[PDB]
Design an enzyme around this catalytic site. Structure first.
Site, PDB file in Angstrom:
ATOM      1  N   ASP B  50       0.819  -1.214   0.000  1.00 38.77           N
ATOM      2  CA  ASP B  50       0.000   0.000   0.000  1.00 38.77           C
ATOM      3  C   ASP B  50       0.855   1.267   0.000  1.00 38.77           C
ATOM      4  O   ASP B  50       1.658   1.486   0.910  1.00 38.77           O
ATOM      5  CB  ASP B  50      -0.953  -0.009   1.205  1.00 38.77           C
ATOM      6  CG  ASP B  50      -1.968   1.124   1.168  1.00 38.77           C
ATOM      7  OD1 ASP B  50      -2.364   1.553   0.062  1.00 38.77           O
ATOM      8  OD2 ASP B  50      -2.381   1.577   2.254  1.00 38.77           O
ATOM      9  N   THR B  84      -1.405   4.644  -4.763  1.00 42.45           N
ATOM     10  CA  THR B  84      -0.176   4.461  -5.530  1.00 42.45           C
ATOM     11  C   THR B  84      -0.250   5.210  -6.862  1.00 42.45           C
ATOM     12  O   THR B  84       0.710   5.872  -7.265  1.00 42.45           O
ATOM     13  CB  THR B  84       0.109   2.961  -5.782  1.00 42.45           C
ATOM     14  OG1 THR B  84       0.095   2.250  -4.537  1.00 42.45           O
ATOM     15  CG2 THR B  84       1.463   2.763  -6.453  1.00 42.45           C
TER      16      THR B  84
HETATM   17  N1  LIG Z   1      -6.791  -8.391 -13.352  1.00 45.19           N
HETATM   18  C1  LIG Z   1      -6.328  -7.165 -13.607  1.00 45.19           C
HETATM   19  N2  LIG Z   1      -5.790  -6.943 -14.852  1.00 45.19           N
HETATM   20  C2  LIG Z   1      -5.306  -5.727 -15.165  1.00 45.19           C
HETATM   21  N3  LIG Z   1      -5.277  -4.626 -14.373  1.00 45.19           N
HETATM   22  C3  LIG Z   1      -5.824  -4.871 -13.128  1.00 45.19           C
HETATM   23  C4  LIG Z   1      -6.356  -6.068 -12.667  1.00 45.19           C
HETATM   24  N4  LIG Z   1      -6.805  -5.922 -11.356  1.00 45.19           N
HETATM   25  C5  LIG Z   1      -6.540  -4.674 -11.068  1.00 45.19           C
HETATM   26  N5  LIG Z   1      -5.940  -3.959 -12.098  1.00 45.19           N
HETATM   27  C6  LIG Z   1      -5.486  -2.535 -12.165  1.00 45.19           C
HETATM   28  O1  LIG Z   1      -4.377  -2.347 -11.260  1.00 45.19           O
HETATM   29  C7  LIG Z   1      -4.462  -1.067 -10.595  1.00 45.19           C
HETATM   30  C8  LIG Z   1      -4.484  -1.286  -9.093  1.00 45.19           C
HETATM   31  O2  LIG Z   1      -3.205  -1.709  -8.628  1.00 45.19           O
HETATM   32  P1  LIG Z   1      -2.755  -1.640  -7.094  1.00 45.19           P
HETATM   33  O3  LIG Z   1      -1.383  -2.162  -7.065  1.00 45.19           O
HETATM   34  O4  LIG Z   1      -3.760  -2.289  -6.234  1.00 45.19           O
HETATM   35  O5  LIG Z   1      -2.684  -0.043  -6.790  1.00 45.19           O
HETATM   36  P2  LIG Z   1      -3.818   1.078  -6.443  1.00 45.19           P
HETATM   37  O6  LIG Z   1      -5.164   0.461  -6.411  1.00 45.19           O
HETATM   38  O7  LIG Z   1      -3.547   2.184  -7.377  1.00 45.19           O
HETATM   39  O8  LIG Z   1      -3.439   1.566  -4.943  1.00 45.19           O
HETATM   40  P3  LIG Z   1      -3.581   0.709  -3.570  1.00 45.19           P
HETATM   41  O9  LIG Z   1      -4.367  -0.519  -3.874  1.00 45.19           O
HETATM   42  O10 LIG Z   1      -4.385   1.660  -2.756  1.00 45.19           O
HETATM   43  S1  LIG Z   1      -2.251   0.303  -3.029  1.00 45.19           S
HETATM   44  C9  LIG Z   1      -5.712  -0.386 -11.101  1.00 45.19           C
HETATM   45  O11 LIG Z   1      -5.294   0.612 -12.049  1.00 45.19           O
HETATM   46  C10 LIG Z   1      -6.528  -1.565 -11.653  1.00 45.19           C
HETATM   47  O12 LIG Z   1      -7.482  -1.182 -12.658  1.00 45.19           O
END
Ligand SMILES: Nc1ncnc2c1ncn2[C@@H]1O[C@H](COP(=O)(O)OP(=O)(O)OP(O)(O)=S)[C@@H](O)[C@H]1O
Ligand SMILES: Nc1ncnc2c1ncn2[C@@H]1O[C@H](COP(=O)(O)OP(=O)(O)OP(O)(O)=S)[C@@H](O)[C@H]1O
Lengths: 484, 484
Positions: B50, B84
């Protein structure tokens, strides 16, 4: 043994060497461009704006830099004008290439897109080129006017461009190419520049007995000596020249005093000890062959001039080999105050003859002042959109490199190169103008077709192809072997 | 006195400080993202992916870097997920800005285009956002599934997402917002993760005489002590609590032995010396007021719970304050093997509750996996085309900065970030897909709407607005004054 750079140290060494000589001639471009003074080993001084004359006679020793002096050398050989533009583009193609090289995009993917974009650039300039009827003299005057401009606005006078067009349209051998050798260039003094009116051998006649000016003269160029003793051993030599049927005789060596009487006895006019440089001039202008044996002098080895006359022009009595009427060959008496001015007014006509001659042969012209550069740039970026793969970025970098000429035109003008680059780019979208460009004197973006700023299509097509093929080869080097 | 950087040395100092902390959290993004271990002064160890938890608790001392830790802090406060993504974008907006600053494009022309592009980006995300009916449970399950994914694929099990949706749809106060405080979170042990079923005070009852579980209990939270001697001086204090009508009594201080008999004599259950952290939990969950005087205890200062029960869960006998039926308040018994796993399974639900709650309140979702980032990027570059001036380049740099998220997704996946960046870009032109994105497990570009990779519109809209407003302010600094 002895010098080698490895991979990344070799690629960057060759790109930097091509860019460093490109910035040397980058300020010369444009109507408000700069001049360069070159002082070599001898201490001989010469000031020139022309991009090709700088790179040839200055001290250059880097292996990668010497290869880029072949682009402008083949630009002056094929076209003439646009030697500066051909080098600057090649430098920007190296700058946009190393930006891709640092991102680990393979050079072969770069060379794949660079060639495909240059293949499309040639088949996009064909539409944006305007057709100029070969004898449309009002446009031909504008094309000639655009050629004189660039070397000087004070050189560009209305009356000068009208004279040039008449000469080029006359020397056209129907149908229907233009031979540049048919126009004779004469460099004489006298308070002129404006007195310029529509080979000159620095010698006289070998005998005062000989006459002075023929009509439809046959000229025998002899390299061999016509020599002797005191027992008329030249009566054969004189008759052998008479056997061919040449009333004019240019001899490179010395003509003996006995032969002088006999040649003048026939009516044949001769000249003794003409410079070797002038003999090569006479052979190509009149269509003559330099013969090194008096026994084998043929009638088909003789040249044909229109008017041969020993005028006492500017005090000095010199042989005026020119001339005609309903004329397939034309002589230009380029005159000025000092000899250094005359030579510059001689070289200014050289570019003016080329463009009008190219317009008759092709049909074809494009808008100058960085106008067609923007049109081709926006048409290749949308062309890049329909390409899948990593080769797209090479086409994008190829199209983004085309905006260097309009950017450098503002760099030497005084105006901002970041602000105008947007103004013209937005004035090319959808449809209009295609002919929109930057006028350095006015400041604001103007239509170049209505301004009279036009250049032949060969000035742009050759410059792109010569720069693309050179940069493609330079991006194919990863190891450098330099001995000594 | 004491520290100052001048103009160019101040602008570059602030941009570099924002970029250096952006690269620290740049590898964490994506399903195949990396984790970070932080060791502070105490030697306390904690590993987290996170982005917001890293920047808050680590040692950061640069003035310019501390200002960027307010973007993610207001990202977790407003949205929760996408902390992020909000930081990485802000770093790329600084990289694309200094490229314009070195070309002598004035910062105010940059801030003019950056704001205008962000104003357009918000009014372009509205169309590409899909409407999700508030009770469309099959899509709500997918939205919840997409939230659990990202923290772990093994965490993302079919049965878990079905449980979450049922809880959020029940706590909706018609009509028709979602209160996140209505869902109670419980952290207990036992071999679970799968045994997770649809305030917990670590204390017991003050007297064994008192009963154990009510229906519809009124809870009086007292901060003041209910104390004494040996002459029934608590019969007033007990009756004053009975005057309000509270059968449950949580006391922060100590309850005396005489009062224990009288409270149990009435039927009122009390607890002595509950932690100050748990008292603040009870006040907000049940809707209670912490009263520091027994004489002024009112009936409208009492909270309302559904089920209060002293269960001997996991061996320990603790007070279960939850509960309901046709329920406006729901309790989630989040369980796992070790307490460190439980806390992570507790934080994974926190993100899952937010997205489903946001979908009910808005209607709105966008395709994830760097899908809507490409669609918004191509729509702003064509928007830049219709802008005249130097502010166009600021919009172009704003749109080119949007392609950082899909590029970084490939950077941590293993595939080339230069090749896919073209494949998706070409698959967005003209019409389709709008929902085309990169699937890190498959490798090839897939339709994200059919894959089940969807995120709320607030995750993207907040992240852009929080990053744009921060970078606009940071580009407005030319002098830095740092004393001490
Ligand atoms: N199966 C998947 N395939 C492609 N992209 C995905 C998938 N699941 C989630 N995402 C994308 O990955 C990103 C989320 O990545 P995370 O590493 O969880 O970071 P974040 O959500 O920006 O911040 P956090 O969760 O608060 S740390 C988003 O832009 C989503 O749309
Ligand atoms: N009045 C004008 N307004 C705007 N552009 C012009 C004008 N006249 C010429 N040009 C452009 O200026 C360029 C010519 O500049 P020059 O400095 O002469 O260099 P070059 O022709 O590339 O090379 P040379 O002449 O062989 S040195 C061409 O691209 C022309 O189209």
């Amino acid at each position: 043994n002895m010098k080698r750079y490895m991979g990344r140290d070799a690629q960057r060494m060759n790109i930097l060497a091509g860019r460093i000589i490109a910035e040397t001639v980058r300020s010369t471009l444009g109507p408000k461009g700069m001049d360069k003074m070159l002082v070599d080993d001898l201490g001989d001084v010469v000031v020139t704006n022309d991009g090709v004359t700088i790179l040839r006679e200055m001290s250059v020793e880097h292996p990668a830099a010497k290869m880029l002096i072949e682009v402008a050398k083949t630009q002056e050989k094929e076209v003439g004008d646009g030697t500066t533009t051909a080098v600057v583009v090649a430098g920007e193609l190296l700058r946009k290439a190393e930006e891709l090289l640092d991102q680990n995009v393979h050079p072969t993917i770069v060379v794949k897109g660079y060639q495909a974009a240059a293949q499309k650039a040639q088949e996009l300039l064909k539409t944006i080129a305007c057709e100029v009827g070969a004898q449309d003299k009002e446009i031909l005057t504008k094309i000639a006017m655009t050629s004189i401009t660039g070397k000087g606005a004070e050189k560009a006078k209305e009356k000068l461009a009208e004279i040039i067009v008449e000469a080029v349209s006359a020397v056209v051998d129907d149908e229907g190419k233009v031979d540049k050798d048919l126009i004779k260039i004469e460099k004489k003094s006298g308070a002129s520049i404006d007195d310029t009116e529509l080979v000159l051998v620095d010698k006289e006649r070998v005998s005062a007995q000989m006459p002075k000016k023929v009509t439809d003269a046959k000229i025998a160029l002899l390299n061999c000596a016509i020599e002797e003793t005191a027992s008329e051993m030249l009566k054969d030599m004189v008759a052998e020249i008479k056997a061919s049927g040449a009333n004019v005789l240019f001899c490179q060596k010395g003509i003996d005093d006995l032969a002088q009487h006999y040649l003048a006895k026939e009516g044949i006019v001769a000249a003794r000890r003409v410079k070797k440089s002038d003999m090569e001039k006479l052979a190509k202008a009149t269509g003559a062959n330099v013969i090194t044996n008096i026994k084998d002098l043929s009638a088909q080895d003789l040249g044909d001039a229109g008017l041969v006359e020993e005028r006492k022009i500017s005090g000095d009595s010199m042989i005026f080999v020119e001339e005609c009427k309903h004329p397939k060959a034309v002589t230009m008496l380029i005159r000025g105050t000092t000899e250094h001015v005359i030579e510059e007014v001689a070289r200014a006509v050289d570019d003016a003859v080329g463009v009008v001659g190219c317009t008759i042969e092709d049909g074809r012209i494009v808008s100058g002042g960085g106008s067609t550069e923007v049109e081709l740039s926006m048409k290749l970026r949308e062309y890049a959109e329909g390409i899948s793969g990593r080769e797209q970025l090479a086409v994008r970098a190829f199209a983004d490199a085309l905006e260097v000429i309009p950017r450098t035109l503002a760099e030497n003008a005084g105006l901002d190169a970041i602000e105008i680059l947007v103004k013209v780019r937005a004035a090319h979208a959808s449809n209009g103008n295609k002919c929109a460009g930057l006028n350095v004197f006015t400041g604001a973006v103007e239509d170049m077709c209505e301004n009279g700023v036009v250049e032949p299509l060969r000035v742009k097509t050759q410059a792109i192809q010569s720069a693309a093929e050179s940069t493609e080869m330079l991006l194919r080097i990863d190891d450098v072997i330099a001995a000594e």
